[PDB]
């Protein structure tokens, strides 16, 4: 079921810098690519992002539900949502449909805010289709190319790093992972978010 | 049956006797103002003073936000206002979920007035005793400003005032308001109206609140003026 | 068979809500203070005869690990509202996996009170709640009302002769007051309002001490503070 | 994993004349290969000038006949006039189609005499389709018997032709047909009931068949 | 002061009595039955001249073989007519034959009394004349808010119904021919009516035994009948 | 209350709630409608506070369907909810029948719903009087009028609202059949101004044809009002 | 099982057989597959006999309701839409009704095809049932607008004959009705196909006809 | 089974669909009109699949959009139209599957000319061109080869002619007649082509 | 005084005024009379005629073979009760293939009366029924607006029932062991006494139900013969 509209999402952490990358393919019947702009990463808050992979309709439905809930909470509280709260609500939403679930495997990436000045701590996590949250504190992968991404990140991860090194490592890992998958690829997009600014770039990937 | 209150039932002249009482209660609340300018829409208001121990920081009791492009002011019962504000937020977010686009203000005011009318007609429950001044911005029509009431009656306005002494505030607005106005000039006019309606020659920075919404840089955003900002504004006003 | 027993009168005034406020104004007083590094809710329980056990009746409760609450009115309404607030906090935590924010809880309780004063076949609550707490956004002290409208305070009182107690509390209060000084001021205000002689088992106090769990003073600690 | 359908077997035949109708039916109730009892009538009298016969599940046909009789009684009570055969036919069609997804396992023949003294005979199916005819047969022996009736009445594939038919000849032909069905079928039965509806009321007679 | 279904000291429901009082006003209508068929006629109280005169109809058809004439609250009358025609067509679907007039009147009365629980909310306040033909013959019935329906030989409803029925009893006689019934009905309607009788001032309908089909007389038939009425 | 009769017969046989709703209708703004040949004219008054109110907000005259059009007088919120109900019914009819809803059907439906809200417990009568203009299924123009009691009637020219009797009396002595568009608009403006202060901001007239509902331009209304004012004096 | 209909200068022609089968055995040889839904609308039967008959009569009842209420004759389009909606409500339940609704309304002569899956289609020539293909082939090969009524009825009868000839499920009698402005007429109420074959293909009764 | 083609470019949009009504092994009509649904304003919805399913869904969506436009006195935006259609299709998929493929197209004063693909599972996404049905396999590649920025309507029609010729020559089900809907310059034009 | 506004309020003396008003409505109706003997039960009634152009309204009714009832009071409530009883009898015969026990049916209708009397927002039936039947023995039953029923030897309803009751009590001993014809004659005597201004085949209803005698109204000719016999 996941082969239909395959996808890949990845995320890495560094020193006061985080990165999330995704593939840009939307296919049909597995072996027929239809569009090359379907982006799996959606901005949910100024410092919270969610990368969803799986059935496209399920992705869109879940994104809309999350946007509704997050906007409601933010308006009611008149303050930005925390990554902890977003992750917990995502787990609850995923479990709410344990039977007849959403065929999507999302990952949450962003900054945890430590007030006292203020501090930004990278936050990453990956989920199952039921909401099986599992914190990892380092690279997170999700999609049909999970195995290749796991291998690449294990071989290439360098612990904390400068944002340039983080971008290089994540881009190389994603490009290597996609090149070994047939139902995923067709361009890649990378986001590097840091407290000061956010950079979005698109790679010159193998578009065939 | 013997204890029935006769809520949804026409009066011998067709007024229901309950909307009228709710409106007369509205007239006793503190005054709220509304202006539309070339740079944004303003909803200056007047804070009712309960004591000197209220938390001055934040604690906005008259102006609220329904969405990134919609924000309104209350002129009646606070509890009814809060429940209706909640309903407004749910309605706006439900529309965004359905159509993947921000809801035009007219739809929101229509839905709010629909729920108020439903409470005014069906059942035997008393009507909501609150009247808003919903203002916002959207691409279809641009800056707008409306005015509801307990009967679900709504109408557009360029500049208006509700609550106690709304007559004098409206007179001042009609005397001074102009078609094309700067945001700062609109703030000055709002301060003048609040001062005149309150019967105070010089408004007190601790007795009023102001806010405005503008589509700066193509991204609509609201600003709620703070104590220092309102102090500077009143300094400018007295300067002129 | 389900109609509104509370209705607008000429000029409105929601007479039932006025009567609920009158009910509140005749009950035992209770006050609260927001200090520099903590919040306090104190109240006075009428001198009980030798039969009552103060350990069985409590006017100070805790909703969460950081939020405390006191009331002044009908005990049964207080109990039901307290249970509903606990359930609300639990269901919030089940979703967001964190302690419920004070403002959110105040909003839910106010909405419930509003619905009760609107729905037909029922009558308004006859109490005036007082919720204090600590969260990421500092300290908070809110006051609910039978009308269902909440206020954000830093030092307040409710119940009998609340005007004079409020004036006294305002006379001696500062934004930078220490927690111990706030406890002393609360004791002094309660003693002034009592019109008698106070002692252990005659007052109840709860405090949110910085980043520490909300704690209800035992009789020994209150006695030590009294000296 | 239980199938709520069993064929109790049997045969019902119906023939019409100018101003009379004959309806014959077996009187054997049976199971897969054994016989419950030697007497269980399948023809139920609906009105003074209308009867119904059925083949299939015994319980289903009994319930259907009882329900139709109740409906007819309620109709006559509420409208003060006995329903016509056409009205009864349409009512039975509606009743049958009501259970379109759990249909009765009952094949029905409705015989009667219209208000103009015409023998009318409606044949149905298990779901509700019904069509008027001048001769019909339902049950196990339907296939064995229908060709004989077609040859006798319709008389196609013939050149001499002979249409002179009366009540006695029709009754004798019906008896011969039912006897032949009993000879060449095993679910047919052993004793048969013959109802004759005429302008002057109705009559019922009995005939004895083989027991095998 | 009291519920809809409170008994009076004399045993009469207040709401039903008030509905009976209300139905006493409106356009006058008359109806007659004879061995050939049934005829109904209405006053046709036309308002200002700006009305089309086609929308305002006092003679509808419950079914092909049933006609009716109402009085009182028009909206409730239309609701009753809709329910009656729905039930008549339901009967036709369930039974190939056409519904008898008596059964239709029974259903109408049952709906009218539904307001008492034993959904609607109060008595309808409508009085109806239902005329038609079935195998049992041609007949007409009268229905009132109280629920008690009664067969009639020659009846009248609406304002001035007292004079109309007085004239009917003074003149109506059995064995009357259809033309005689038509002239009698139109004469009575003219007598009770306030304005001068004209083609557009009245409306008539009739059901025949031979046709058994509802037929509403048009302008030509009305004028033809008018010419022959006695002066 | 909830599910319990609120409108009941009085001792004289009158539904006092319906009469009070009619009285409330009589308190609302005025409206006029004319028809001729294959087009109709709808006019409604207007009352706004100068320099403050936004005229675009008022929607006293509305379009229900591709061809149908409606005007109303009475409580505005009731008008809006009833209009939404009517539009939903229009689309339901167009679903179930695959043809645009004819004017007669929609007038009957409005009458039915107004009657229903008058004969059910726990709900009070709709305090609005409406008039619809449209084309029949046989491509014929017709206008109907509906009142709070639920009784509806087709008219050739009719006015509702304050002093509707005076405007009706004026129309009864001036209406003509198959008039021209300019003459129809002139008559509509005259009828509405018979009871309404004379100014171009107190009327928003429109013309309905098979093509679509067209709002008359403000300059034309100004010229017409100036002309009728000159004729009056 | 075969029903046929087409549209020509003088209105519409409808034709049907009369066979009814319970599998390999024919239950009845004479049935009515044309129902007068309205005074000016007819509808044929194909597939499930009970479902088709019951739903045709239900549609007739609804049409009577609407006509009486609104005081205007309904159009074939509205009836087709109603039938399609009600059939679609029972999608996936086993209904196997295939209908052709033909009639005259204020818009003119109309003909629609409806299915158990809510398949509403508009045209001027239709045929359904097991013998539909043969009827289509015989029509298209010789069908033409603006031909006299006699030629139309002859063509319809020939098409029905040929459909019955090569179909086990089609046979019995040929019924041909004509729909015009004022109602309809039964040009051929019932015609045994026996003499029809022995008149068309094998006019001389000598030796078996070989095909 | 039902071939749909769509090509969007600067200041023009084009939709194409074969005109056939298949029942069993025969064609009910050669001029099927159940595939195109024009919404009031500048909006078109092209459906492919079972005749009844597409009829129901298209009527539902079109009449709901008309209801919205009449109630709110405005014109629904193209993006709002497309996403409302996607949401409804997904909802019914979850309860009562609608085996229908969707091609939404339109013009908006805000986003310009735009087109949207949609699979029978509601796998909707914005696209510059696309196809539906088995015939898609034989046209998509061609659309890639001859499409280029700054295209003109005439070149789009030439590409569509090439696609039609390809379907006629190589596609199992030889499709000959096609119907074209061209949206441009605030005009919607209908054409019929036979290869 | 002020305790008659609702049917759920007991007056200071302990009486339900709404139910009493329902009984008053029952009494205000037309007349009727029922008698029984060793065999056969005879029911008679006056069909009310409102005008010379109105056929008299039906009075007696048949619920099932061997079971018939007579009405006094509100006609709509009578129709509702008759429909209920007919449905009950038909359902019992359908699902048990035997005649319903009369007493059980009377209990069911009385329970319906009681249920309508108990709950507020509902009114008590203002109609009285006179059930007559032969379930292996002649039986006459009476039912009242309050849940209550009784079994009689001779019964009368409303109108000027005083005269009919006096005549019945004056001749009760002779009813038992009396022929059917004489029973019908006595019933006609009782009705004529109630009339207090003549009996005709049009304005009088008569019925008999007894052993081997399903409920059947007396034909016009037989009724006229009986009327002539009583007249002389």
Contact of F81 with chain H, judged by CB distance below 8 Å, is answered with no
Instruction: DSSP letter for F203, please.
Output: B
Q: Find the chain H residues whose C-beta atoms sit closer than 8 A to any C-beta of F.
A: 59-60, 63-64, 66-67, 70-71, 73
Contact of H122 with chain A, judged by CB distance below 8 Å, is answered with yes
Cross-chain residue pair E4–F111, CB shorter than 8 Å: no
Q: What is the separation of C-alpha E193 from the centre of its chain, rounded to a whole number of angstroms? A: 17
**Residue D170: both structure tokens together:** 């029709």
CA distance C156 to chain B (A): 7
CA distances from F42 to A110, F78, F169, F192, F209 (A): 60, 20, 18, 10, 11
Which fold is adopted by the domain A7-204?
A: 3.60.20
Q: What is the full DSSP assignment across B78-108?
A: HHHHHHHHHHHHHHHHHHHHHHSSPPPHHHH
Q: Is G81 a catalytic residue?
A: no
CA distance H137 to chain G (A): 27
Task: Find out whether C159 and C152 touch, Cβ atoms under 8 Å.
Answer: no
Rounded to an integer, what distance in angstroms lies between the CA atom of residue I115 and that of residue I118? 5
At how many Å resolution was this determined?
Answer: 3.1
Contact of E95 with chain G, judged by CB distance below 8 Å, is answered with no
Bridge-based pairing of strands G98-105 and G2-8 is unpaired
Q: How many domains in chain D?
A: 1
Cα E36–Cα E38–Cα E44 angle in degrees, nearest 5: 145
Rounded to an integer, what distance in angstroms lies between the CA atom of residue H149 and that of residue F207? 46
Four-CA torsion G136, G139, G145, G150, nearest 10 degrees: -130
Domain limits for position D192: 4-208
- CATH number (2.70.98.50, 3.10.290.10, 3.60.21.10, 3.60.20.10) of E4-226 reads 3.60.20.10
Helical H runs in chain F? 16-26, 76-97, 103-116, 164-172, 181-193, 218-232
Match 């709509």 to its residue by tokens: I76
Cross-chain residue pair A68–B67, CB shorter than 8 Å: no
Rounded to an integer, what distance in angstroms lies between the CA atom of residue D206 and that of residue D200? 20
Contact of B99 with chain H, judged by CB distance below 8 Å, is answered with yes
Cross-chain residue pair E95–D78, CB shorter than 8 Å: no
How are strands ordered across the β-sheet holding B155-156? B63-67, B70-73, B135-136, B144-147, B155-156
Task: Select the residue from G61, G68, G69, G71 to test the E interface by mutation, using most E Cβ atoms within 10 A.
Answer: G68
Q: Domains of chain A: which residue ranges?
A: 7-204
Cross-chain residue pair B177–F51, CB shorter than 8 Å: yes
Contact of F137 with chain G, judged by CB distance below 8 Å, is answered with yes
- Listed by number, the residues of chain D in 69-108 with a beta carbon closer than 8 Å to a beta carbon of chain I are 69-70, 73-74, 77
Match 């809060």 to its residue by tokens: B82
Contact of I90 with chain D, judged by CB distance below 8 Å, is answered with yes
List chains adjacent to chain B, taking adjacency as at least 3 C-beta pairs closer than 8 Å: A, C, F, H
* Active-site choice (G1, G2, G44, G164): G1
Domain limits for position G142: 3-190
Could you tell me which residues come within 8 angstroms of residue B126 by beta carbon, excluding any fewer than 6 positions away?
B5, B7, B18, B22, C4, C6, C7, C8, C118
Backbone angles phi and psi of D26, in degrees to 5: -70, 175
Q: Kindly tell me whether chain A and chain C come into contact, counting contact as 3+ Cβ pairs under 8 Å.
A: yes
Residue F3 counted as domain residue: no
| Coarse DSSP helix, strand, coil percentages of chain A, rounded to the nearest 5 percent | 30, 35, 35
Could you tell me which residues come within 8 angstroms of residue D197 by beta carbon, excluding any fewer than 6 positions away?
D20, D21, D22, D23, D49, D50, D51, D111, D112, D113, D119
| Superfamily name with CATH number, domain B1-239 | Aminohydrolase, N-terminal nucleophile (Ntn) domain (3.60.20.10)
Q: How many domains in chain F?
A: 1
Match 């001021």 to its residue by tokens: C185
**Residue D44: both structure tokens together:** 């139920």
Rounded to an integer, what distance in angstroms lies between the CA atom of residue A110 and that of residue G68? 68
Closest CA to A78 of C107, B205, B187, B208: C107
> What domains does chain C contain, in order, with CATH numbers?
5-227 (3.60.20.10)
Give the chain C residue nearest F121 (alpha carbons): C1
**Residue G133: both structure tokens together:** 């293909």
Backbone angles phi and psi of B76, in degrees to 5: -165, -145
Residue G159 counted as domain residue: yes
State the helix-helix crossing angle for F181-193 and F218-232, rounded to 10 degrees: 60
Cross-chain residue pair G54–D128, CB shorter than 8 Å: yes
Number of H helices, E strands in chain H: 4, 12
Number of H helices, E strands in chain A: 4, 12
- Listed by number, the residues of chain G in 10-39 with a beta carbon closer than 8 Å to a beta carbon of chain D are 20, 22, 25, 27-28, 30-32
Could you tell me which residues come within 8 angstroms of residue H50 by beta carbon, excluding any fewer than 6 positions away?
G117, G119, H99, H100
Could you tell me which residues come within 8 angstroms of residue B73 by beta carbon, excluding any fewer than 6 positions away?
B32, B34, B43, B45, B62, B63, B64, B132, B133
F28 C-beta neighbours (distance < 10 Å), count? 22
Helical H runs in B105-155? 105-121
- Listed by number, the residues of chain A in 15-34 with a beta carbon closer than 8 Å to a beta carbon of chain H are 26, 28, 32, 34
Contact of F19 with chain H, judged by CB distance below 8 Å, is answered with no
CA distance C117 to chain B (A): 10
- What CATH number has the domain bearing residue G119? 3.60.20.10
Q: Domains of chain B: which residue ranges?
A: 1-239
How many residues are present in chain C?
227
Residue F120 counted as domain residue: yes
Task: Give the nearest partner residue to F11 out of E18, E47, E76, using CB atoms.
Answer: E18
Cα E18–Cα E22–Cα E23 angle in degrees, nearest 5: 120
- Which chain I residues contact residue E106 at CB under 8 A? 79
Q: Find the chain A residues whose C-beta atoms sit closer than 8 A to any C-beta of B.
A: 64-65, 67-68, 71-72, 75-76, 78
Match 């594939």 to its residue by tokens: D157
- What CATH number has the domain bearing residue I67? 3.60.20.10
How are strands ordered across the β-sheet holding A140-143? A140-143, A8-13, A18-23, A188-193, A198-202
Could you tell me which residues come within 8 angstroms of residue E92 by beta carbon, excluding any fewer than 6 positions away?
E63, E98, E99, G61, G64
Task: Find out whether F144 and F104 touch, Cβ atoms under 8 Å.
Answer: yes
**Residue C179: both structure tokens together:** 């927690």
CA distances from B136 to B72, C31, C159, D23, E15 (A): 8, 41, 42, 84, 53
- Residue D135, judged by CB atoms within 10 A of its CB (0-12, 13-18, 19+), counts as buried
Ramachandran bin of C17, using left for φ above 0, alpha for ψ from -120 to 50, beta for the remaining angles: alpha
Task: Find out whether F71 and F42 touch, Cβ atoms under 8 Å.
Answer: yes
SS3 B240: coil
Rounded to an integer, what distance in angstroms lies between the CA atom of residue D132 and that of residue D121? 6
State the helix-helix crossing angle for D167-184 and D142-149, rounded to 10 degrees: 150
CA distances from C150 to B65, C20, C35 (A): 18, 15, 20
Backbone angles phi and psi of F104, in degrees to 5: -60, -45
CA distances from E171 to D174, E33, E163, E176, E181 (A): 63, 13, 12, 11, 10
Domain limits for position F218: 16-232
Cross-chain residue pair F99–G75, CB shorter than 8 Å: yes
Task: Find out whether C38 and C26 touch, Cβ atoms under 8 Å.
Answer: no
- Residue I198, judged by CB atoms within 10 A of its CB (0-12, 13-18, 19+), counts as exposed
- What CATH number has the domain bearing residue F85? 3.60.20.10
Q: Kindly tell me whether chain F and chain G come into contact, counting contact as 3+ Cβ pairs under 8 Å.
A: yes
Architecture of domain H2-195: 4-Layer Sandwich (3.60)
Cα F155–Cα F157–Cα F159 angle in degrees, nearest 5: 100
Bridge-based pairing of strands D191-198 and D202-208 is antiparallel
Rounded to an integer, what distance in angstroms lies between the CA atom of residue A46 and that of residue H80? 25
Residue G205 counted as domain residue: no
Tell me which H or E stretch contains E93.
helix E74-94
Q: What is the full DSSP assignment across chain G?
A: -EEEEEEETTEEEEEE---EESSSSEEES----EEEEETTEEEE--B-HHHHHHHHHHHHHHHHHHHHHHTSPPPHHHHHHHHHHHHHHTTTTT--BEEEEEEEETTEEEEEEEETT---EE-SEEEEETTHHHHHHHHHHH--SS--HHHHHHHHHHHHHHHHHT-TT--SB-EEEEE-SSSEEEEES--BHHHHHHHHT--S-SS----
Four-CA torsion A71, A77, A78, A80, nearest 10 degrees: -70
């Amino acid at each position: 079921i996941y082969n239909y509209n395959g996808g890949c999402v990845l995320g890495m952490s560094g020193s006061n810098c985080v990165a999330i990358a995704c593939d840009l393919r939307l296919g049909a019947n597995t072996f027929t690519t239809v569009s090359t702009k379907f982006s799996k990463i959606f901005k949910m808050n100024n410092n919270v992002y969610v990368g969803l992979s799986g059935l496209a309709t399920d992705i869109q439905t879940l994104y809309e539900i999350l946007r509704y809930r997050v906007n409601l909470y933010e308006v009611r509280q008149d303050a930005e949502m925390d990554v902890e709260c977003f992750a917990n609500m995502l787990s609850s939403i995923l479990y709410s449909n344990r039977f007849s679930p959403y065929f999507v495997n999302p990952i949450v990436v962003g900054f945890k805010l430590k007030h006292y000045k203020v501090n930004y701590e990278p936050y990453l996590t990956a989920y199952d289709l039921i909401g099986a949250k599992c914190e990892t504190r380092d690279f997170v992968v999700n999609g049909v190319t999970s195995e290749q991404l796991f291998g690449m990140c294990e071989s290439l991860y360098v612990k904390d790093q400068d944002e340039n090194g983080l971008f290089e490592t994540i881009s190389q890992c994603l490009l290597s992972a996609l090149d070994r998958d047939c139902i995923s690829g067709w361009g890649a997009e990378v986001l590097v978010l840091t407290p000061e600014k956010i950079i979005k770039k698109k790679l010159k990937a193998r578009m065939d | 049956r013997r204890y029935d209150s006769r809520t949804t039932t026409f009066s011998p002249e067709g007024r229901l006797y309950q909307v009228e009482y709710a409106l007369e209660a509205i007239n006793n609340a503190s005054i709220t103002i509304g202006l539309i300018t070339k740079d944004g829409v303003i909803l200056g208001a007047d804070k009712v003073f309960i004591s000197k121990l209220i938390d001055k920081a934040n604690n906005y009791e008259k102006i609220y936000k329904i969405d990134k492009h919609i924000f309104c002011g209350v002129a009646g019962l606070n509890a009814d206002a809060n429940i209706l504000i909640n309903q407004s937020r749910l309605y706006a977010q439900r529309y965004l979920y359905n159509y993947n686009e921000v809801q035009p203000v007219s739809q929101l005011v229509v839905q709010i007035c629909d729920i108020k009318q439903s409470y005014t007609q069906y059942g035997g429950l008393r009507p909501y005793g609150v009247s808003f001044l919903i203002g916002g911005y959207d691409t279809k029509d641009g800056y707008q400003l409306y005015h509801t009431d307990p009967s679900g009656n709504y109408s557009g306005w360029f500049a208006t005032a509700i609550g106690t002494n709304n007559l004098t505030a409206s007179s001042v607005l009609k005397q001074e308001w102009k078609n094309d106005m700067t945001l700062e000039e609109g703030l000055l006019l709002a301060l003048k109206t609040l001062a005149k309606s309150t019967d105070t020659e010089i408004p007190k920075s601790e007795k009023i609140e102001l806010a405005y919404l503008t589509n700066k840089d193509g991204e609509v955003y609201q600003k709620y003026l703070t104590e220092k900002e309102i102090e500077e504004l009143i300094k400018l006003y007295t300067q002129k | 068979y389900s109609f509104s027993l509370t209705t607008f009168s000429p000029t409105g005034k929601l007479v039932q809500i006025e009567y609920a406020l009158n009910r509140v104004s005749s009950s035992s007083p209770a006050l609260g203070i927001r200090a520099k590094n903590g919040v306090i809710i104190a109240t006075e329980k009428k001198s009980p005869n030798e039969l009552i056990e103060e350990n069985s009746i409590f006017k100070i409760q805790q909703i969460s690990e950081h939020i405390g609450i006191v009331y002044a009115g009908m005990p049964g309404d207080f109990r039901v509202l307290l249970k509903r607030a606990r359930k609300e906090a639990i269901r919030y935590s089940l979703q967001y996996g964190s302690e419920i924010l004070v403002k959110e809880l105040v909003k839910i309780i106010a909405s419930i009170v509003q619905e009760f004063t609107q729905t037909g076949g029922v009558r308004p609550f006859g109490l005036s709640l007082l919720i204090c707490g600590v969260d990421v956004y500092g300290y908070h002290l809110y006051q609910i009302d039978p009308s269902g409208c909440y206020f954000n305070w830093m030092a307040t009182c409710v119940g009998k002769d609340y005007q004079n107690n409020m004036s006294f509390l305002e006379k001696r209060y500062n934004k930078d007051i220490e927690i111990e000084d706030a406890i002393h001021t609360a004791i002094l205000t309660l003693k002034e309002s009592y019109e008698g002689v106070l002692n252990e088992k005659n007052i109840e106090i709860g405090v949110a001490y910085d980043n520490k769990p909300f704690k209800i003073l035992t009789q020994n600690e209150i006695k030590d503070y009294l000296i | 994993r239980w199938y709520p359908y069993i064929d109790n077997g049997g045969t019902v035949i119906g023939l019409t004349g100018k101003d009379y109708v004959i309806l014959a039916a077996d009187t054997r109730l049976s199971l897969s290969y054994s016989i419950y009892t030697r007497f269980c009538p399948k023809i139920s009298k609906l009105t003074d000038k209308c009867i119904i016969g059925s083949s299939g599940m015994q319980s289903d046909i009994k319930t259907l006949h009882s329900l139709l009789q109740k409906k007819i009684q309620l109709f006559v009570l509420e409208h003060s006039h006995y329903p016509d055969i056409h009205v009864i036919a349409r009512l039975l069609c509606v009743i049958l189609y009501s259970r379109r997804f759990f249909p009765y396992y009952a094949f029905n023949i409705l015989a009667g005499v219209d208000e103009n003294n015409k023998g009318v005979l409606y044949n149905y199916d298990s779901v509700g389709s019904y069509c008027e005819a001048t001769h019909s047969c339902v049950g196990s022996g339907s296939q064995l018997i229908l060709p004989i009736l077609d040859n006798r009445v319709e008389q196609k594939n013939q050149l001499i032709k002979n249409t002179n038919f009366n009540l006695g000849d029709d009754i004798n032909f019906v008896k011969d047909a039912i006897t032949s069905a009993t000879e060449r079928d095993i679910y047919t039965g052993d004793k048969t009931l013959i109802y004759v509806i005429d302008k002057m009321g109705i009559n019922v007679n009995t005939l004895d068949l083989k027991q095998d | 002061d009291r519920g809809v279904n409170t008994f009076s000291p004399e045993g009469r429901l207040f709401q039903v009595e008030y509905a009976l009082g209300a139905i006493k006003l409106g356009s006058t209508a008359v109806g007659i039955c004879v061995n050939d068929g049934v005829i109904l006629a209405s006053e046709r109280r036309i308002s200002s001249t700006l009305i089309e005169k086609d929308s305002v109809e006092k003679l509808l058809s419950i079914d092909d073989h049933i006609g009716c004439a109402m009085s009182g609250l028009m909206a409730d009358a239309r609701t009753l007519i809709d329910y009656a025609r729905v039930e008549c067509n339901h009967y036709k679907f369930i039974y190939n034959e056409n519904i008898n007039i008596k059964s239709c009147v029974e259903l109408i009365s049952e709906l009218a009394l539904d307001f008492s629980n034993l959904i609607m909310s109060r008595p309808f306040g409508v009085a109806l004349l239902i005329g038609g033909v079935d195998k049992n013959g041609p007949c007409l019935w009268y229905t009132e808010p109280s629920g008690t329906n009664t067969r009639f030989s020659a009846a009248s409803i609406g304002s001035a119904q007292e004079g109309a029925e007085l004239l009917l009893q003074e003149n109506y006689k059995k064995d009357m021919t259809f033309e005689q019934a038509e002239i009698l009905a139109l004469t009575v309607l003219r007598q009770v009516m306030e304005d001068k009788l004209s083609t557009s001032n009245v409306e008539i309908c009739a059901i025949k035994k031979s046709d058994q089909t509802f037929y509403k007389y048009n302008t030509d038939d009305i004028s033809r009948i008018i010419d022959v009425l006695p002066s | 209350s909830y599910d319990r009769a609120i409108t009941v017969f009085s001792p004289d046989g009158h539904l006092l709630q319906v009469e009070h709703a009619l009285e409330a209708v009589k308190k609302g703004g005025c409206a006029v409608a004319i028809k001729s040949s294959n087009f109709a004219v709808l006019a409604v008054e207007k009352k706004n506070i100068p320099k403050l109110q936004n005229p675009k907000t008022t929607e006293k005259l509305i379009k229900l369907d591709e061809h149908n059009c409606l005007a109303f007088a009475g409580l505005n919120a009731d008008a809006r909810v009833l209009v939404n109900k009517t539009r939903l019914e229009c689309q339901r009819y167009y679903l179930n029948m695959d043809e645009p809803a004819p004017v007669d059907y929609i007038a009957k439906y409005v009458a039915k719903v107004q009657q229903k809200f008058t004969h059910r417990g726990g709900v009070r009568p709709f305090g609005i009087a409406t008039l619809i203009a449209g084309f029949k299924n046989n491509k014929e123009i017709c206008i109907y009028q509906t009142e709070p009691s639920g009784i509806y009637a087709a008219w050739k020219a009719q006015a509702i609202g304050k002093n509707a009797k005076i405007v009706q009396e004026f129309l009864e002595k001036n209406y003509q059949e198959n008039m021209e568009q300019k003459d129809c608009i002139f008559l509509a403006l005259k009828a509405i101004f018979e009871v309404v202060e004379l100014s171009s901001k107190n009327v928003e007239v429109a013309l309905l044809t098979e093509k679509d509902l067209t709002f008359i331009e403000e300059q034309e209304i100004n010229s017409m009002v100036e002309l009728i004012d000159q004729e009056r004096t | 099982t075969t029903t046929l209909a087409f549209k020509f200068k003088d209105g519409i022609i409808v034709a049907v057989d009369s066979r009814a089968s319970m599998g390999s055995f024919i239950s009845s040889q004479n049935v009515e597959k044309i129902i007068e839904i309205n005074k000016n609308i007819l509808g044929t039967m194909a597939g499930g006999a009970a479902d088709c008959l019951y739903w045709e009569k239900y549609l007739g009842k609804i049409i009577k309701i609407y006509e009486l209420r609104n005081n205007e004759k309904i159009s074939v389009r509205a009836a087709s839409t109603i039938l399609s909606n009600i059939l679609y409500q029972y999608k996936g339940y086993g209904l196997c009704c295939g209908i052709i609704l033909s009639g005259y309304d204020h818009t003119g002569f109309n003909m629609f095809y409806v299915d158990d899956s809510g398949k509403k289609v508009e045209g001027n020539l239709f045929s359904c049932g097991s013998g539909s293909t043969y009827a289509y082939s015989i029509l298209d090969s010789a069908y033409d607008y603006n031909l006299n009524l006699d030629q139309a009825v002859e063509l319809a009868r020939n098409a029905i004959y040929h459909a019955t000839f090569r179909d086990g499920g089609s046979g019995g009698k040929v019924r041909v009705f004509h729909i015009h402005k004022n109602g309809y007429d039964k040009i051929i109420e019932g015609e045994d196909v026996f003499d029809l074959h022995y008149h068309y293909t094998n006019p001389e009764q000598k030796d078996q006809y070989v095909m | 089974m039902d071939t749909l083609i769509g090509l969007r470019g600067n200041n023009f949009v084009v939709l194409a669909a074969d005109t056939y009504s298949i029942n069993s092994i025969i064609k009910l009509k050669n001029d099927d009109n159940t595939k195109f649904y024009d919404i009031h304003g500048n909006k078109c919805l092209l459906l492919g699949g079972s005749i009844g399913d597409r009829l129901q869904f298209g009527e539902f969506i079109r009449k709901n959009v008309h209801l919205y436009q009449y109630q709110n006195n405005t014109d629904m935006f193209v993006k709002s139209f497309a996403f409302f259609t996607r949401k409804n299709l997904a909802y019914y998929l979850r309860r009562n599957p609608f085996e229908v493929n969707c091609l939404i197209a339109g013009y908006d004063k805000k986003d310009g000319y735009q087109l949207y693909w949609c699979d029978y599972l509601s796998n909707m996404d914005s696209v510059n061109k696309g196809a539906h049905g088995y015939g898609a396999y034989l046209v998509s590649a061609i659309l890639d080869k001859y499409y280029h920025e700054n295209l003109t309507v005439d070149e789009a029609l030439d590409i569509f002619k090439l696609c039609f010729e390809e379907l006629k020559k190589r596609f199992l089900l030889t499709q000959i007649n096609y119907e074209l809907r061209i949206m441009y310059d605030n005009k919607v034009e209908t054409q019929y082509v036979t290869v | 005084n002020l305790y008659d506004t609702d049917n759920i309020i007991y007056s200071p003396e302990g009486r339900l005024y709404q139910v009493e008003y329902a009984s008053e409505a029952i009494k205000q109706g037309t007349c009727a009379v029922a008698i029984k003997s060793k065999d056969y039960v005879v029911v008679s009634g006056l069909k009310k005629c409102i005008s010379k152009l109105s056929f008299p309204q039906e009075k007696i009714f048949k619920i099932d073979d061997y079971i018939g009832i007579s009405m006094s009071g509100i006609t709509s409530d009578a129709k509702v009760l008759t429909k209920f009883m007919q449905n009950e009898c038909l359902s019992h015969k359908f699902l048990y293939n035997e005649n319903i026990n009369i007493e059980s049916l009377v209990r069911s209708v009385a329970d319906k009366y009681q249920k309508n009397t108990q709950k507020s927002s509902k009114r008590a039936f203002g109609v009285g029924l006179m059930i007559a039947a032969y379930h292996n023995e002649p039986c006459i039953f009476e039912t009242r607006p309050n849940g209550s029923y009784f079994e009689y030897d001779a019964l009368s309803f409303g109108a000027r029932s005083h005269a009919s009751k006096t005549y019945l009590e004056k001749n009760l001993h002779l009813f038992e062991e009396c022929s059917l014809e004489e029973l019908i004659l006595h019933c006609l005597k009782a009705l004529k006494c109630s009339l207090s201004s003549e009996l005709t085949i049009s304005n009088t209803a008569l019925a008999v139900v007894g052993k081997n005698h399903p409920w059947q109204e007396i034909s016009s000719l037989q009724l006229e013969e009986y009327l002539s016999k009583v007249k002389m």
